Amino acid sequence: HPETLVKVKDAEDQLGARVGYIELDLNSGKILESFRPEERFPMMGTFKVLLCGAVLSRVDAGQEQLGRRIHYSQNDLVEYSPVTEKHLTDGMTVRELCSAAITMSDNTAANLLLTTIGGPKELTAFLHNMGDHVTRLDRYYGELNEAIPNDERDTTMPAAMATTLRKLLTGELLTLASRQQLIDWMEADKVAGPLLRSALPAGWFIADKSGAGERGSRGIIAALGPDGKPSRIVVIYTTGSQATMDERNRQIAEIGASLIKHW
């Protein structure tokens, strides 16, 4: 994808930052194109899809129920909890929590779900067990933010994340019901408008999950395709930029426009 690689490298120039990129064929798993596929980037909230994959594996095993109601309190609420902060009294079901975590990127929802699966170490063990020896979740939201240079906590690589997303959405790891639920939550994503969705022509399918973080971090994982059906996985990460979120959004959108134009 020569024109798209030109745009990915341009994004690095414009942002003064690293950009990682991969296109993966959904059906075959082949890498169609990549840039920095095996460099680490902060995952940010894109891990929330993997988290709910782990939750669904427990549901499939009969050890979790999507309808199970979880009660929590004020002290559970962390920064950016637009859905969970409304249900202190009523609580929320596991299904509602995954919807909040994926479609709104609700941070308390992610913490509550992490607790149900045994925490970050158990999520990382789940990933390791399905063949991803790279992606690691280390911290709950709200844990102390001691800046470490080249911090490897809470990171993935574009190729690892793309392969792992493909396995979750199409592999035999999850039941059909759970695969469909996971992609349905991603299709209902509400906070990724200015990224790939802004470049997407009418009639196209997209299921995605955005992320944002300090130090210029911004990213998206997606399954998308024309004619109402996904046929490709796209993963884009950037970190290090001093640019505003608008500028990072725009570079990702422009990569998306190139992706679509040269589909």
UniProtKB/Swiss-Prot annotation:
Active site positions: G45 (acyl-ester intermediate), E143 (proton acceptor)
Entry EC no(s): 3.5.2.6
Biotechnology: This protein is used as a marker in many commonly used cloning vectors, such as pBR322 and the pUC series.
Molecular function GO labels: beta-lactamase activity
Disulfide bonds: C52-C98
Positions that bind substrate: K209, S210, G211
Catalytic activity: a beta-lactam + H2O = a substituted beta-amino acid
Gene Ontology BP term (one): beta-lactam antibiotic catabolic process
Alphabetized Pfam families for the sequence: Beta-lactamase2
InterPro entries attached to this UniProt entry: Beta-lactam/transpept-like, Beta-lactam_cat, Beta-lactam_class-A, Beta-lactam_class-A_AS
Keyword set includes Signal: yes
Keywords recorded for this protein, A-Z: Antibiotic resistance, Disulfide bond, Hydrolase, Plasmid, Signal, Transposable element
Effect upon mutating R139H: In TEM-6 and TEM-16
Superkingdom of the organism of origin: Bacteria
Extra remark: The beta-lactamase present on pBR322 was cloned from plasmid R1 (R7268). The class A beta-lactamase family has a specific amino-acid numbering system, sometimes called Ambler or ABL numbering and often misspelt as Amber. A multiple sequence alignment was used to derive a consensus sequence and then the consensus was numbered taking into account insertions and deletions. This allows use of identical numbers, e.g. for active site residues, despite differences in protein length. UniProt always uses natural numbering of residues, hence there appear to be differences in numbering between this entry and some papers.
Function: TEM-type are the most prevalent beta-lactamases in enterobacteria; they hydrolyze the beta-lactam bond in susceptible beta-lactam antibiotics, thus conferring resistance to penicillins and cephalosporins. TEM-3 and TEM-4 are capable of hydrolyzing cefotaxime and ceftazidime. TEM-5 is capable of hydrolyzing ceftazidime. TEM-6 is capable of hydrolyzing ceftazidime and aztreonam. TEM-8/CAZ-2, TEM-16/CAZ-7 and TEM-24/CAZ-6 are markedly active against ceftazidime. IRT-4 shows resistance to beta-lactamase inhibitors.
Homology family: Belongs to the class-A beta-lactamase family.
The protein's name in its UniProt record: Beta-lactamase TEM
Lineage of the organism: Bacteria, Pseudomonadati, Pseudomonadota, Gammaproteobacteria, Enterobacterales
